[PDB]
Structures are given as structure tokens and as C-alpha cells.
Amino acid sequence: SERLLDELTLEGVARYMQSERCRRVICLVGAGISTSAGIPDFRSPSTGLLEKYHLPYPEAIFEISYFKKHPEPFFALAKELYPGQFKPTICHYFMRLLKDKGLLLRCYTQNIDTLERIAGLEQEDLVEAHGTFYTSHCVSASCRHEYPLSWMKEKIFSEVTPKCEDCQSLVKPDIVFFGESLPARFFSCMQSDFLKVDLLLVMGTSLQVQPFASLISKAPLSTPRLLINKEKAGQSDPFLGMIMGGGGMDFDSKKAYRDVAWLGECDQGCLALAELLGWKKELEDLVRREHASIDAQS
Ligand SMILES: Cc1cc(C)nc(SCC(=O)Nc2cccc(COc3ccc(NC(=O)c4cnn(C)c4)c(Cl)c3)c2)n1
Ligand SMILES: [Zn+2]
């Protein structure tokens, strides 16, 4: 397959991004792009997750059937985990620069914290693969009244189980609970976007949650894939790889031709890439302006 990168380094990726061959970038992002914003990863053991509620199994608090009959536990956790402020990271604003420079095809996020929207990505730019707290809906099939985060926040902090003003049904945040399908939008956008992608930028995800992780296998064979992450991720598991074989990351073998791993904090990796691209002053000015604005509204 074609080698579009002149070397398997951040420097090689930057030169490719500055070439006429790189027009359409897809970002895949996870909890690792929001930890520097003080949003802990609810999957991280060190900020791991309630015994009084008698959960049949730990993951029942995020299962749709359990939630609809016993929603109190989930809403108690929602108050406990509610961020003190919503200040997007250097990584979020790097994706805003991709948008500004006409390079952003799509940002696929596993995060529910709304920081991509606050950083200035529009709904059209975004696939919230695991849903979002940004909007909530009445669960009654005939109603489905939509409620904004401002409304849901008041209910969470008041410790009042949120009920629909029209029909008094439960109102659920638009997150994908276990037992719910990923949004139709995820599959529809994936089918179109991965025909068009020139660069896959994977940031702040261990690529362990499916089917989101399998997106890396949907990239054309020639498409360079840059991982910015604290740990190497996306390589075929030596044990699972025996079952399902094709598309796994290859950073370090003699056959490696398009995959690059930059190991460190997402903010530092995005700053390093911005610096190579001549965007460092633009990124600094954007971040300090937006942070100042958020600080003054907080
Ligand atoms: C705007 C806002 C509001 C709030 C309250 N927090 C935040 S960020 C802090 C935080 O982590 N809050 C939080 C609080 C309660 C529960 C949860 C749990 O969130 C989830 C999201 C998606 C999912 N869905 C999936 O992974 C999923 C499903 N199927 N597949 C295949 C994957 C789950 Cl299981 C849980 C998070 N941001
Ligand atoms: Zn309703």
C-alpha cells in the first residue's frame, strides 16, 4: 500500500498535513482529551465509581432497563460526578483550529462532557458516539419532549428525579446506556466519512470500547493514523487477534508504513503538532481567550 508519510514521526505527519494530499481529517477522541480539564475518566480505576442502592451488578447503574425502574442511583452519581467548570483543553481547541483551517471532516467522540461543543465544534462536525448530557429527552415514546442541560443540571443538584413537564414521564440524558443502540448517526456518518478521510487523528482513547475502537479498521489502507495518547493503543491483541485476525495499529514492526504513536498527554502532543504546523501562537491566543471568557462566566 502507498506510503503517504515520508517518515513515521510527528514531523512526518506535520509535513503530510501541510501537503495538498491531506485535506480531510477525522478525529477519534476519548476520556484522555478531558482529564486535563478536570473531567475524570469514569472507566479509570483511580477515579473509579453506591452500596446503599443494592445494584444487581456494578454496571447496572448504566443499564437502560434498570435506570427506567430505578433512576435514583444514576442521578445521585450524576450530582457526584458533575464537573465544577466546563473549560475545554488545548486538545479540544486544536480540533477547533482544524475546523477553522477547513481540515476537519468529523470529530467522533466517546465523551459526554460537551467540551467539543464549548470549544466551538458544531453538531455537523460532531458524532457523539456514546451520546451526551448536552440534551435530555422524556422517555415516553409518544412525547419525547427535549430538555436542555440547564434544565437537567437544576434537577440533578436539587436531587429531584427529573420528570417531563408535559406527561410526568422520566427524563433521561441523551447518553447511550448499556442496552441502548449507538446512534444511527454514528453508523451513517462512519459509512460516508471513511470513504473521504486523508488522516485519522486518534487522541486520548485506549481503543478498548466497541464498536467505537473498530473505527480504526474502517480507514483506507493508505490513510496515515496518528495516535496521541499516554500509552500505545490499537495494536491487535495477541490472544483476541487469533479469533478475529486486519486494521490493527502497526507502529514498530519492519512492515509499519502509516501508523505513528506520540506518547504523552494529549495537550502536549497537540501543542507539539501545532508548533510543527506554525499554529502554536494561534493555539495559545485561542486557548487563553476562550479560557479567560469561561473563567469570567464561572
Ligand atoms: C455535561 C456533564 C454532565 C455530567 C453529569 N457529567 C459530565 S462529565 C463527568 C461524568 O463522567 N459524568 C457522569 C455522570 C453520571 C454518569 C456517567 C456515565 O456516563 C456514561 C456515558 C456513556 C455511556 N455509554 C457507553 O460508554 C456505551 C454504551 N454502549 N456502548 C457500546 C458504550 C455510559 Cl455506559 C456511561 C457520567 N458532563
Ligand atoms: Zn413527556
Author numbering: 55 to 103, 107 to 302, 304 to 356
Paper excerpt:
Human sirtuin 2 (SIRT2) is an NAD+ dependant enzyme that has been linked to the pathogenesis of various diseases, making it a promising target for pharmaceutical intervention. Sirtuins, belonging to class III histone deacetylases, constitute a family of highly conservative NAD+-dependant proteins that are involved in the regulation of various biological processes such as metabolism, aging, inflammation and oxidative stress. Although sirtuins were initially recognised solely for their deacetylation activity, recent studies unveiled a broader catalytic scope that includes desuccinylation, demalonylation, demyristoylation and ADP-ribosylation. To this end, we expressed human SIRT2 56-356 as a N-terminal His6-SUMO fusion in Escherichia coli and purified the protein via affinity and size exclusion chromatography with tag removal in between.
The most potent and subtype selective SIRT2 inhibitor 29 (RW-78) exhibits an IC50 of 26 nM, which outperforms its lead structure 24a (IC50 = 79 nM) by a factor of 3. Additionally, the chlorine or iodine atom engages in halogen–π-interactions with F235. The spacing between the chlorine atom of 29 and the centroid of the π-system of F235 (3.6 Å) matches the average distance of C–Cl⋯π-bonds (3.854 Å),50 explaining the high potency of 29. Contrary to our design, 29 and 31 do not engage in interactions with the SIRT2 co-factor NAD+ but stabilize the enzyme in an inactive state. In addition, by interacting with the inhibitor, F96 and R97 move into the NAD+-binding pocket, displacing the co-factor and prohibiting NAD+-binding. Therefore, the determined structures do not show electron densities for the co-factor, although 5 mM NAD+ was included in the crystallization screens. Notably, the NAD+ displacement is supported by thermal shift assays, which revealed that 29 increases the melting temperature of SIRT2 independently of NAD+. Compound 29 showed high target engagement with an EC50 value of 15 nM, validating our data obtained from in vitro inhibition studies.
